[PDB]
């Protein structure tokens, strides 16, 4: 859909004008998420291999959650930039149009008949 | 670095002699002097029609004539 | 499902393998004078 | 996924064989390398789907420099007329579509 | 479409140069040097206009600058030049390199009657420059104007309203 | 195979699917199948038996014909556009010949014949090489020709391979032909919604990559091709059965799981478009895979099928096969749908 | 168009068919697919020189290259089917049913 | 010749470019003899 | 057309002795014979060797192909990355022969 | 008749092809595929493709066929309805496309294609002192730098893999 807005800058993950953006917090709930779905990956890791599951290697666990949690919190920034583009690029596009997105005249329901259906 | 090689020339001089031949071509065109001449030449062969450029009034470089001084010249390939 | 049809499949082997189901022998006659029998690999 | 590495990294690995208008060797032009340029030029920049519609012409010149088919279309219904007059005997071809005219230069 | 626009056969008749091709390589560095101008209009005039119907006249003038060329080769030295073109035109790849004393009579024959001196290796692939008095071309492809281009973008750029806007997700 | 030689046929096969990503001609699209093709036939001959070389004649046939058929295709796009940019193409007839081209080399139904063979006849890392990344390169030239592709042939090829690609997995035992049936299916979801919203195509490709991954490396973990065999796990892994349950449930696209996450959306942009009739059949045929998927799950998972006296020695080794991301590859295929608006990352 | 791509593209069309219906044997298969490459070098070369467009004369020699090279990986795959069943009927090539 | 064909224009480019086209080989000797056009179409490279 | 001339005639005289050479001696009325090998009827056995060495001639023959318009392309001006690119073609196929040494392929027919 | 002569080269170059297509056995396969690239290689010399066609006889057939009819004979043992079937149906079916181009002069059976001798496209100058072919293909070196290392990679790994697929081990 987006194909053509990002093809005179290709390859970029996060552009320049992503930096206009408000980056996610590190207390992103989604972030937590992401830093729990790197918990369960260490954990399901000392399963498979027959370790004690809560015990073993907690570094392995915690290079787990900080390597979720880096991976997904440059997911995070460029899904924010590509919803921000998508809007912009909505908003533009109905301020340059304005002859396809007229004001619809809201009429009030004093003059708005609406057939009324009994349930008996 | 000194038995091998003699060892090497003499069970295999074929071998040798490919290896030192490839290594001269790689390394030799560019220890050459005459590697620049063999590209002005290849560049001073006229395939196509000199295009003549439209004379604005400004062009001190580009001759009226081709018998005029200015211009690229070929002094280096008649004399070497 | 077994039908008709796939009633003479067997399942196949376990470790994916199927058993793999000579040389050449040349006789350079008398045409000294020596008859020759050649088993020959190649 | 048209992961664009060739104009990321500023690298020209298969762009010169793309088009007929680029850059050849000794300068030698395509037959059609003025339709091209023209219907690249046109295109150049606004999209396909305005492409197809706003470029027409600069396409349909260019396809029949390419295949030739309306400029034979035309040459069948002359000659074909030509032939028809021919055996109807209301047509006599010139001394140059003949042979005896002593050619130009 | 229109109608093509060709010029009628009195405006193609000239006064052809009907003369064999190893006449021509054997005058072709004095052609060069000696009609040189009328040449480079004629051919700056045809890489300009990129129509040759643009072009007959000065194409004339190639035509009539090329005659007065031999005709003052006729006059002069016609003896030195016709057994220099024999010597040329009995070659199958027509080499300059068998024919060097004969190009020598004939280049001291021209060097003495009239002048001329023969350009040396490089002077003839010189890229000149020309000047002119027909108007440049302002657009030689008739190329008619090109789509105007999509409207670009513009302005800071905003977050997204109320996130992602996918069924529920409040980010 | 040499380890040397090995690392660099497989790097030649990466390098045969990049440049067919990267590449702005269709000659190095046509080079980059012929160099893939040419480096993943050793890939398939690893163990040298009759079934591999079989699989290979098999592979190479259907594959060659479709290079050529690639190639007709560049060819009659060059008669009608006198170019070579990859980019729509200017003729149906090439349109149409290069969908068929690529239909046969993703294996898309009617083309789909040569998928369970092959993956039958090689092994369990080559056929996760076959199913995952011998899918990425004509994706790739498929999102960038979908201007010209015909709307009636690519939703006939859709609807083909998701029907019989149900149909198919519901006879099998063989775990590899259970795998290559789901992934004629899943093609079949990917390309129903690629003139609609590629994005979710390109969703559904890493979704279905992370799935067949995880259930091909949970394959090789326990050394299992068949059905019967995958019914020792409990026996001699508890957590793989645990793994496979949660992966085929996920693969049939129960909520909330991840699997669930593709052929939604790819609904969520099927009736934006006004169609209903077709989402909804597709919908329902993915209830065939979902069978299939369950008839493991019940072998495996929820039951205990009875094991032999020798397992009892395996009980005293532990697995020493590198079990890469299988982890990482398990919670990414099932934990994955609270984050499924992370899609936007594909646009 | 032109008169000579009616019969290159028919050519290509007979050698599709003909690689699209086996007999028995899987030579006379890559003789087929063979064929495919030869008319689409034919057919291409002859683009390419009406046209003018200088930077793709390289492109048909690439075409062979590549096809040829694939030619061979077939020629060896036959091979070694012929060396599990002495010859190379396609027949044979059926255990993958089961 | 072409006078008793209906919605003929004599001299009509198939172009819709008013620019000049480089003429073919059908359009030059389509109507001359068929040595002239063997000469002109094969000449060179039939040249031994 | 001169060279398709000379074809002509190289193949009408080359047909024209094979039928003489088939034919001359078939007007004689020699006698008729009954006439009823080292292998004796054994099946022809597969050569490996044979095979790897003409698919060795194949694989070098399109690096041949390749190397054919170096004649040609010594006339261009960029020759840094030409004589780059015919270094690199040429060492290409010296490691193609020497990996075809290495594992052992050129054996046998060495 | 001679204006039509690449015409008639192609109509020999498609009866080649409905010579192996029909599968008679693989070495009169082999033959008719040698017959069919000798013409299709006259069709392409006479558009100017002299290196081209060159390359089909050195390459196309005294380097690959010669290799199809090594390992051929090397294989089915030495000493049909359908195959003669199929070449008569294929030769009607083509002679057919002759007549029906010949008397129309157009014909349509996926694209419209002209009737007339296939000279009329060609085009009225000179390239000067040099084969456009000839150098097009010399800028393989020049401006073909990454479809080198395509190319080489290509036949290096192909090397690679006939090695590996032929050993058994
Ligand atoms: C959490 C979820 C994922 C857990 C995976 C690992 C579980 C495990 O290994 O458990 C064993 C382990 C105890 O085992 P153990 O005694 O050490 O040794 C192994 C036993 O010997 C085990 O004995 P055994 O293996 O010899 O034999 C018994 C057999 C028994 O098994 C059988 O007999 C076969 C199976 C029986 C039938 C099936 C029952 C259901 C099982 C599958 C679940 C399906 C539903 C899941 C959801 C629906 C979708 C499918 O197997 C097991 O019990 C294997 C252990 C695993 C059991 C639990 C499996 C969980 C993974 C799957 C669910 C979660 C992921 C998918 C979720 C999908 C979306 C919701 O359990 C725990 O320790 C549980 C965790 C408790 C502490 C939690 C602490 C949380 C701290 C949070 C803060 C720090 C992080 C901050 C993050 C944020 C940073 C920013
Ligand atoms: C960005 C995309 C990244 C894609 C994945 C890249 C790695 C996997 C591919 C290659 C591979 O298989 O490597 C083995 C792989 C481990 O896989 P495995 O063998 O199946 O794991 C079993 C145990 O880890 C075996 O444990 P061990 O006893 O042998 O030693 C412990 C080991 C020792 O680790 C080290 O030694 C690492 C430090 C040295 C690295 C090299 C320095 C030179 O610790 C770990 O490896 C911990 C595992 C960390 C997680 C692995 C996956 C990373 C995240 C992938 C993307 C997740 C995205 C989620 C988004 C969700 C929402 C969309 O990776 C590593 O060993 C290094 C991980 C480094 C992660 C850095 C992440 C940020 C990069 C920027
Ligand atoms: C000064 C600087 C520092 C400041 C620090 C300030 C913070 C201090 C506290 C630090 C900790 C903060 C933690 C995050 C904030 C709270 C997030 C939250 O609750 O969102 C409410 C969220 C929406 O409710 P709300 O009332 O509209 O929003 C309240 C806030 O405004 C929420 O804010 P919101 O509206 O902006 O949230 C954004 C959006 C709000 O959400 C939405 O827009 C709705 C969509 C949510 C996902 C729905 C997916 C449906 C299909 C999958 C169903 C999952 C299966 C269930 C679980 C299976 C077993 C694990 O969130 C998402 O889309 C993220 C996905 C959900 C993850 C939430 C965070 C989890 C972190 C820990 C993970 C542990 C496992 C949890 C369970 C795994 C599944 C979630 O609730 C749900 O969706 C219900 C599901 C449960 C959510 C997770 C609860 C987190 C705490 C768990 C602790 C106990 C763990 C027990 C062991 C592990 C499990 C067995
Ligand atoms: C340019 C290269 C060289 C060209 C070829 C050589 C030049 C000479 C060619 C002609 C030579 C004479 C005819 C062939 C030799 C006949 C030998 C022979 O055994 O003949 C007996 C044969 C048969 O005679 P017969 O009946 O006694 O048969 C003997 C065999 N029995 C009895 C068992 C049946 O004679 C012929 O066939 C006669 C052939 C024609 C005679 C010559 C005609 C004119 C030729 C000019
Ligand atoms: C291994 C490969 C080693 C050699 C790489 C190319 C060297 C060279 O001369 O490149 C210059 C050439 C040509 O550069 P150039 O400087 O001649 O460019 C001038 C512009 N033209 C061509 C119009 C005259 O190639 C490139 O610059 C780009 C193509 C190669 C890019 C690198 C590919 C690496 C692949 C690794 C796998
Ligand atoms: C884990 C992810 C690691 C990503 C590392 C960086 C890669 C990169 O720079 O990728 C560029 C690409 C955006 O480039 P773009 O031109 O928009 O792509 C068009 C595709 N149709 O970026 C992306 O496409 C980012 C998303 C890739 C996700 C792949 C795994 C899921
Ligand atoms: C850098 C320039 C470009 C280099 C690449 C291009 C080379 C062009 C020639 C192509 C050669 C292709 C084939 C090469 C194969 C080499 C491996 C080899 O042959 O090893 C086996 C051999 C022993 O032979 P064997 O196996 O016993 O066979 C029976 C015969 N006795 O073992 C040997 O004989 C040992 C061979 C290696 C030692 C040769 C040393 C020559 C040194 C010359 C001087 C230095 C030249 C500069 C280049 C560096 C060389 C190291
Ligand atoms: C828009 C998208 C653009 C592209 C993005 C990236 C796409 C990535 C696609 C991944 C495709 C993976 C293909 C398979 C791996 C290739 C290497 C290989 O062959 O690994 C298997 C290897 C063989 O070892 P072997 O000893 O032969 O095992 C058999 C038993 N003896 O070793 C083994 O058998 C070890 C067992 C475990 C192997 C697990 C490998 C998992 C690889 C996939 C990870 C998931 C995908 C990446 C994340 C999502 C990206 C989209
Ligand atoms: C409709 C699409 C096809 C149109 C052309 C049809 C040509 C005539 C062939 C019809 C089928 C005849 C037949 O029996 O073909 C089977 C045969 C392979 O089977 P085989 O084992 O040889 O014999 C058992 C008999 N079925 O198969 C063959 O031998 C087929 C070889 C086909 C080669 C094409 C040659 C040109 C055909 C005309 C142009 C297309």
Redesign the interface.
Same mark, same amino acid.
């Given at each position: 859909?987006?194909? #053509?807005?990002?093809?005179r800058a290709?390859?970029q993950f996060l552009p320049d004008?992503?930096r =206009?953006?408000?980056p996610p917090k590190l207390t992103?709930?989604?972030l937590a %998420?992401?830093g729990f779905?790197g918990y369960? =990956? #260490?954990?399901?890791?000392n399963?498979?291999?027959?370790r004690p599951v809560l015990s073993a290697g907690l570094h392995r666990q915690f290079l %787990?959650i900080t390597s979720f949690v880096f991976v997904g919190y440059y997911?995070?920034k460029?899904?924010?930039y590509? %919803?921000?583009?998508?809007?912009?690029?909505m908003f =533009?596009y109905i301020k =340059?149009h304005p002859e396809d997105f007229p004001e619809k005249d809201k009429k009030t329901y004093r003059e708005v008949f609406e057939e009324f259906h009994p349930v008996r | 670095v000194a038995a091998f090689l003699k060892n090497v020339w003499a069970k295999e001089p074929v071998l040798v002699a490919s290896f030192a031949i490839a290594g001269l071509a790689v390394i030799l065109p560019t220890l050459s002097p005459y590697t620049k001449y063999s590209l002005m030449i290849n560049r001073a062969t006229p395939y196509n029609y000199p295009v003549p450029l439209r004379d604005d009034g400004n062009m001190p470089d580009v001759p009226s004539h081709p018998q005029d001084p200015q211009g690229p010249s070929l002094e280096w390939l008649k004399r070497l | 499902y077994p039908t008709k049809e796939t009633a003479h499949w067997k399942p196949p082997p376990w470790n994916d393998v199927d058993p793999p189901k000579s040389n050449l022998t040349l006789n350079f006659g008398p045409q000294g004078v020596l008859r020759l029998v050649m088993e020959l690999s190649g | 996924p048209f992961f664009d590495v060739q104009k990321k990294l500023g690298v020209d690995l298969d762009h010169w064989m793309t088009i007929q208008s680029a850059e050849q060797p000794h300068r030698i032009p395509a037959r059609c390398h003025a339709f091209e340029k023209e219907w690249i030029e046109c295109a150049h920049g606004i999209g396909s789907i305005r492409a197809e519609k706003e470029c027409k012409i600069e396409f349909e010149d260019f396809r029949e420099c390419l295949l030739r088919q309306k400029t034979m279309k035309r040459l069948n219904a002359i000659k074909r007329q030509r032939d028809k007059l021919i055996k109807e005997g209301k047509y006599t071809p010139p001394p140059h579509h003949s042979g005896q005219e002593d050619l130009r230069p | 479409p229109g109608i093509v626009e060709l010029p009628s056969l009195e405006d193609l008749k000239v006064q052809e140069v009907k003369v064999s091709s190893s006449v021509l390589k054997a005058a072709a560095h004095h052609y060069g040097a000696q009609c040189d101008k009328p040449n480079k209009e004629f051919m700056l005039c045809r890489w300009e206009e990129k129509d040759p119907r643009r072009c007959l006249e000065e194409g004339k003038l190639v035509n009539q600058c090329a005659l007065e060329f031999f005709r003052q080769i006729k006059r002069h030295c016609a003896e030195p030049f016709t057994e220099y073109w024999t010597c040329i035109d009995y070659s199958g790849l027509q080499l300059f390199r068998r024919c060097r004393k004969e190009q020598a009579q004939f280049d001291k024959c021209v060097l003495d009657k009239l002048g001329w001196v023969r350009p040396d290796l490089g002077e003839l692939s010189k890229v000149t420059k020309v000047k002119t008095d027909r108007p440049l071309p302002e657009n030689p492809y008739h190329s008619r104007a090109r789509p105007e281009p999509n409207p670009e973008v513009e302005g800071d750029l905003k977050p997204a309203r109320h996130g992602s806007r996918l069924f529920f997700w409040t980010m | 195979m040499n380890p040397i030689i090995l690392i660099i046929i497989l790097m030649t096969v990466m390098l045969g699917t990049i440049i067919v990503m990267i590449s702005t001609h269709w000659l190095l699209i046509w080079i980059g199948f012929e160099m893939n093709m040419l480096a993943i036939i050793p890939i398939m001959m690893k163990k040298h038996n009759p079934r591999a070389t079989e699989a290979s004649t098999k592979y190479f046939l259907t594959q060659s014909t479709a290079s050529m058929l690639l190639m007709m295709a560049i060819i009659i796009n060059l008669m009608f556009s006198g170019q070579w940019t990859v980019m729509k193409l200017f003729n149906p007839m090439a349109s149409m010949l290069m969908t068929m081209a690529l239909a046969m080399k993703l294996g898309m139904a009617p083309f789909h014949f040569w998928v369970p063979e092959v993956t039958q006849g090689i092994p369990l890392s080559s056929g996760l090489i076959l199913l995952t990344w011998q899918k990425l390169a004509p994706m790739s030239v498929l999102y960038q020709i979908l201007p010209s592709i015909n709307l009636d042939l690519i939703l006939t090829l859709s609807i083909l391979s998701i029907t019989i690609g149900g149909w198919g997995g519901l006879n099998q035992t063989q775990l590899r032909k259970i795998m290559a049936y789901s992934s004629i299916a899943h093609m079949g979801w990917m390309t129903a919604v690629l003139l609609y919203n590629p994005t979710m195509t390109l969703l559904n490709l890493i979704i279905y990559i992370i799935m067949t991954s995880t259930m091909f490396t949970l394959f090789m973990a326990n050394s299992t091709t068949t059905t019967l065999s995958l019914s020792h796990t409990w026996n001699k892994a508890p957590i793989m059965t645990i793994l496979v349950l949660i992966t085929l449930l996920s693969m049939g696209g129960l909520p909330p799981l991840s699997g669930f996450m593709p052929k939604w959306m790819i609904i969520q942009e099927m009736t934006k478009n006004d169609s209903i009739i077709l989402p909804t059949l597709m919908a329902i045929t993915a209830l065939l895979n979902l069978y299939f998927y369950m008839r493991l799950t019940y072998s495996t998972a929820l039951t205990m099928f009875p094991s032999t006296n020798n397992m009892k020695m395996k009980w005293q080794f532990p697995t020493t096969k590198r079990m890469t991301l299988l982890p990482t590859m398990t919670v990414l295929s099932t934990m994955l749908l609270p984050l499924t608006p992370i899609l936007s990352i594909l646009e | 168009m032109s008169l000579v791509y009616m019969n290159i593209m028919m050519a290509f069309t007979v050698s599709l068919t003909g690689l699209l219906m086996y007999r028995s044997h899987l030579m006379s298969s890559l003789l087929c697919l063979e064929g495919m490459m030869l008319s689409l070098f034919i057919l291409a070369t002859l683009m390419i020189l009406n046209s003018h467009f200088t930077l793709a004369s390289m492109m048909p020699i690439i075409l062979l290259v590549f096809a040829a090279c694939e030619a061979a990986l077939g020629l060896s795959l036959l091979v070694m089917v012929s060396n599990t069943y002495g010859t190379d009927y396609v027949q044979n090539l059926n255990l993958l049913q089961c | 010749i072409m006078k008793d064909v209906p919605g003929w224009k004599v001299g009509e480019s198939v172009f819709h470019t008013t620019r000049w086209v480089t003429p073919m080989m059908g359009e030059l000797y389509g109507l001359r003899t068929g040595e002239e056009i063997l000469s002109s179409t094969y000449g060179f490279i039939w040249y031994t | 057309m001169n060279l398709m001339i000379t074809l002509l005639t190289n193949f009408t005289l080359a047909t024209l002795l094979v039928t003489i050479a088939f034919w001359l001696p078939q007007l004689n009325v020699y006698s008729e014979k009954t006439s009823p090998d080292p292998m004796g009827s054994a099946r022809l056995p597969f050569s490996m060797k044979f095979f790897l060495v003409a698919i060795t001639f194949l694989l070098f023959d399109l690096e041949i192909a390749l190397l054919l318009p170096l004649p040609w392309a010594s006339q261009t001006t960029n020759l840094n990355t030409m004589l780059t690119m015919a270094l690199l073609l040429i060492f290409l196929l010296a490691v193609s022969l020497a990996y075809e040494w290495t594992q052992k392929g050129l054996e046998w027919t060495e | 008749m001679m204006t039509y002569i690449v015409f008639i080269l192609s109509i020999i170059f498609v009866m080649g092809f409905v010579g192996f297509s029909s599968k008679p056995s693989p070495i009169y396969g082999g033959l008719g595929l040698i017959v069919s690239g000798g013409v299709g290689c006259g069709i392409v010399l006479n558009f100017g493709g002299s290196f081209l066609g060159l390359m089909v006889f050195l390459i196309y057939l005294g380097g690959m066929m010669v290799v199809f009819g090594y390992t051929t004979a090397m294989a089915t043992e030495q000493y049909n309805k359908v195959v003669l079937g199929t070449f008569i149906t294929g030769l009607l079916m083509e002679f057919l496309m002759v007549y029906y181009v010949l008397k129309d002069k157009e014909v349509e059976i996926v694209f419209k294609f002209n009737g007339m001798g296939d000279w009329v496209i060609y085009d009225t100058g000179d390239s000067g002192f040099f084969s456009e072919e000839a150098m097009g293909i010399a800028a393989l070196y020049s401006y073909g730098t990454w479809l080198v290392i395509v190319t080489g990679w290509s036949l290096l790994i192909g090397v690679v893999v006939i090695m590996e697929i032929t050993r058994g081990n």
């Open positions: 859909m987006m194909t #053509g807005r990002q093809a290709p390859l004008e992503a =206009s953006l408000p992103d709930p989604r %998420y992401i779905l369960c =990956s #260490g954990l399901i890791d399963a498979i291999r027959r %787990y997911l995070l460029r899904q924010d590509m %919803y921000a583009v998508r809007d912009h690029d =533009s =340059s | - | - | - | - | - | - | - | - | -």
